[PDB]
């Protein structure tokens, strides 16, 4: 198939398993015209609500990117509202807020700030220190 040497072009992964039927409205079939093959029913699928335009298209009304980054941060933070805290947890919900507000991606880096401000963090023999106002 197409230069039989070997095929290393990235192949598509098989389709995830559909959700349980739980309805008996023919949620089983594939060669049935009452629905397409894809079965996406996620946590926040019912917020993507659609209105039938007159031309033939649909006007899907969905929540804004600055809202699902709010919904997620809510979910991610009240994992435990008084429970354990993970280094990976804080660093994630530190970005979900930074994504919540004006999500242009910083253009430079995410750690150049810390790397330069580790002299008021670290105590290093105050004769060789870094006080904002150098005496």
């Amino acid at each position: 198939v197409y230069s039989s040497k070997k095929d290393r072009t990235f192949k598509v992964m098989p389709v995830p398993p559909p959700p349980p039927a739980t309805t008996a409205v023919e949620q089983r079939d594939d060669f049935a015209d009452n629905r397409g093959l894809s079965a996406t029913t996620r946590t926040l699928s019912p917020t993507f609500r659609m209105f039938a335009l007159e031309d033939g298209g649909v006007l899907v009304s969905h929540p804004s990117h600055a809202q699902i980054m709010r919904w997620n941060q809510r979910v991610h933070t009240e994992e435990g509202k008084a429970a354990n805290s993970t280094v990976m947890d804080e660093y994630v919900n530190s970005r979900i807020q930074a994504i919540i507000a004006d999500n242009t991606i910083e253009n430079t880096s995410l750690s150049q700030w810390r790397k330069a401000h580790m002299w008021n963090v670290i105590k290093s023999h105050g004769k060789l220190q870094r006080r904002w106002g150098t005496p």
């Binding site: 709010r70 941060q73 933070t77 435990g80 509202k81 008084a82 429970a83 354990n84 805290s85 993970t86 280094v87 947890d89 804080e90 660093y91 919900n93 530190s94 807020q97 930074a98 919540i100 507000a101 004006d102 242009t104 991606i105 910083e106 253009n107 430079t108 880096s109 995410l110 750690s111 150049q112 700030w113 810390r114 330069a116 401000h117 580790m118 002299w119 008021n120 963090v121 670290i122 105590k123 290093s124 023999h125 004769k127 060789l128 220190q129 870094r130 006080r131 904002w132 106002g133 150098t134 005496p135």
Partner: protein, 694 residues
């Protein structure tokens, strides 16, 4: 005298030499003799006596050795040589690197196994072991062997069974101890005051390779800083207790812990307000972590006019209201400071302030506040030899007389070629000050016409003027070709003033003076070009913290697009991690960012860090090193001369015979640089001379 230690108790069975020197007399020897061979026989002579010394002496000698270290980079980097047996090179750690790996190996036995009671008692000791264990980057031993950050060695990390890297194999120095210190912070701290709960929280962040601090470690003190507060009821208003919040908020910014409540109070409670009286909008201020952090306000007290720690901290918070909320607290802090008439609070609040403005999206509101507060004036007053120019750059009108500064959509200074119009006025030459300091200071925006007529404009970086000034000095000469140029920034100046006084060794601080003598006395002569704070705000992209490591680059990415005819060079050391802004310093990966990011007019100037093109158009010439003359190695050990210290030589001399010509007594192999006498050794059957200088 050859006194100081005493042989072990049971002599004919154990001949080990004890220690009986006073900690002072070890420090005096540590200081008066800074050579490596004496600075080893002090660390080792001290680490043997680490189990007798008092909790206070443990505080001193630890806090003392840090004078030899530096927060910046490679911790134990005392290398001996870069051997070239094979093609590439490898690095050999000197006897002084193996002396701290030995010292830290004696701290992890005294404090972990044989005396686990030693560190709970004196709380200021652990708060010094931690900070020491951070300066010696023991979470990353690879840099004790790494010279060029771009060339990371794996000498202390990677071994092969063929028999390479065996003795310096996998190094685990304090990973035993560094993880016992955290078993002591969780579950005691009753005898810890808030000044140390903070510092201990600052130890476990710094020592980690990136500043994360293993949150259960941190969270065990935050859980203890609330109990220190609950007895006052979260209404703290001691003015120094209102500082320990500005530090608790700078930390938990390096860590990146995002707790609004400490900002819900340090700011004054403006958030948790502007969250009342909503018609229809979000409730961003809360981001509630109520079950974790306590409700906190300060009082009807000061609640305003913060300190520098707070402003460099609120930079990281991307929230639109918090900046306008913190833009008055910078006015008030610049009001109270000016009226108080203090210098240190007046510079500290500005260099920590620009970091705040450098984050707002509105570059105009950012540029308005920069001139109403004389930022180009107060900043430069500090820098050692800048006070002369700050006067002139603060001429009564043209300090910053509302230059055209025509910013277009996206914030990029699209004024280029439409500020080259200048409004047709030629940015006048000589002005006043009859002493013929009359040539006016060359602010970039006023002199962008010159950079166009320039043949090859230069950019300075604080490294190229460190380790020597013989490379800038040359460019100081070429300034008077008319064709060339030189651009220093108010950031590169400030970032030189740090290493001008806060330098590891005087041989380096002496440079940053002679490295700032020229640039401050080549700017006053109207040769160089100072990009001031008013223009570092102009060029930088809104929202990004652009320190001197990126002002060197966003300038070379601005003018490699908005004036493409002229060259650009970078006076820096080949060891700077900013020699490759693509490898380091690159942004988060994104599908929209192209390789055409540099020339497109709609993209921010730092979008070009995701390209090897920016490094391609900006050249990096080593203008001129000092001469390649070899240093006097006649006084160092020589594998060839070593065979001659004891070589019988009777038939060599005839009349003037000496006792033993080659053997320098007391030294190692006649090497007058490798001095060993009066340092603690043991040889009960061979003589030794006492110390004398040379």
């Amino acid at each position: 005298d050859l006194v100081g230690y005493h042989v072990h108790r049971h002599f004919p069975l154990l001949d080990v030499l004890g220690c009986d020197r006073s900690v002072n007399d070890l420090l005096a020897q540590f200081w008066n003799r800074p050579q490596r061979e004496a600075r080893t026989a002090t660390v080792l002579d001290f680490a043997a006596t680490l189990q007798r010394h008092s909790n206070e002496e443990l505080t001193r000698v630890l806090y003392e050795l840090s004078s030899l270290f530096e927060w910046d980079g490679n911790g134990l980097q005392f290398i001996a040589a870069k051997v070239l047996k094979y093609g590439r090179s490898y690095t050999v750690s000197s006897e002084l690197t193996k002396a701290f790996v030995q010292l830290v190996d004696a701290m992890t036995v005294a404090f972990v196994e044989e005396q686990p009671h030693r560190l709970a008692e004196s709380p200021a000791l652990l708060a010094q072991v931690l900070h020491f264990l951070a300066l010696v980057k023991i979470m990353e031993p690879n840099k004790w062997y790494t010279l060029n950050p771009n060339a990371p060695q794996n000498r202390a990390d990677y071994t092969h069974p063929r028999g390479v890297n065996r003795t310096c194999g996998h190094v685990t120095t304090g990973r035993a101890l560094l993880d016992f210190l955290e078993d002591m912070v969780t579950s005691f701290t009753e005898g810890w005051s808030e000044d140390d709960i903070l510092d201990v929280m600052a130890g476990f962040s710094g020592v980690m390779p990136d500043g994360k601090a293993s949150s259960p470690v941190l969270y065990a003190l935050l859980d203890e800083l609330w109990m220190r507060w609950s007895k006052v009821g979260f209404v703290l208003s001691g003015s120094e207790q209102a500082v320990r919040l500005e530090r608790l908020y700078m930390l938990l910014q390096v860590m990146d812990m995002q707790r609004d409540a400490v900002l819900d109070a340090l700011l004054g409670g403006q958030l948790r307000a502007h969250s009342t009286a909503p018609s229809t909008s979000t409730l961003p201020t809360l981001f509630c972590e109520r079950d974790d952090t306590p409700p906190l306000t300060l009082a009807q007290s000061l609640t305003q006019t913060r300190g520098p720690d707070f402003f460099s901290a609120v930079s990281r918070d991307k929230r639109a209201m918090v900046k306008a909320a913190a833009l008055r607290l910078l006015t008030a802090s610049l009001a109270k400071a000016r009226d108080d008439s203090d210098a240190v609070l007046h510079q500290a609040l500005v260099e920590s302030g620009t970091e705040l403005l450098q984050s707002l999206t509105s570059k105009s509101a950012a540029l308005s506040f920069a001139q109403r507060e004389q930022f180009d004036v107060i900043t430069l007053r500090a820098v050692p030899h800048m006070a002369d120019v700050a006067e002139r750059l603060a001429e009564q009108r043209a300090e910053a007389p509302f230059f055209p500064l025509t910013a277009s959509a996206g914030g990029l200074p699209d004024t280029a070629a439409v500020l080259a119009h200048l409004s047709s006025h030629p940015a006048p030459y000589i002005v006043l000050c009859k002493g013929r300091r009359v040539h006016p200071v060359r602010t970039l925006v006023s002199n962008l016409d010159h950079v166009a007529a320039v043949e090859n404009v230069f950019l300075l970086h604080s490294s190229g003027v460190s380790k020597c000034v013989d490379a800038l000095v040359a460019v100081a000469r070429r300034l008077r070709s008319g064709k060339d140029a030189l651009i220093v920034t108010a950031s590169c100046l400030r970032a030189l003033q740090a290493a001008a006084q806060y330098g590891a060794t005087e041989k380096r601080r002496a440079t940053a003076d002679r490295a700032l003598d020229i640039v401050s006395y080549e700017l006053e002569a109207g040769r160089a070009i100072l990009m001031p704070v008013t223009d570092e705000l102009y060029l930088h992209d809104a929202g990004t913290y652009c320190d001197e490591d990126l002002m060197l680059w966003t300038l070379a990415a601005y003018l490699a697009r908005d004036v493409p005819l002229v060259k650009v060079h970078t006076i820096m050391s080949s060891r700077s991690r900013a020699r490759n802004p693509q490898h380091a310093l690159r942004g988060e990966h994104s599908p929209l960012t192209s390789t055409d990011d540099l020339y497109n007019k709609s993209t921010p100037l730092l979008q070009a860090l995701r390209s090897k093109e920016l490094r391609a158009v900006t050249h990096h010439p080593v203008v001129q090193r000092p001469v390649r003359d070899p240093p006097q190695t006649l006084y160092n050990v020589n594998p060839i001369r070593a065979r001659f210290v004891y070589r019988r030589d009777k038939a060599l001399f005839d009349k003037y015979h000496v006792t033993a010509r080659n053997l320098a007594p007391g030294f190692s192999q006649g090497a007058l640089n490798s001095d060993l006498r009066a340092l603690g050794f043991y040889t009960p059957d061979h003589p030794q001379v006492p110390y004398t200088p040379l």
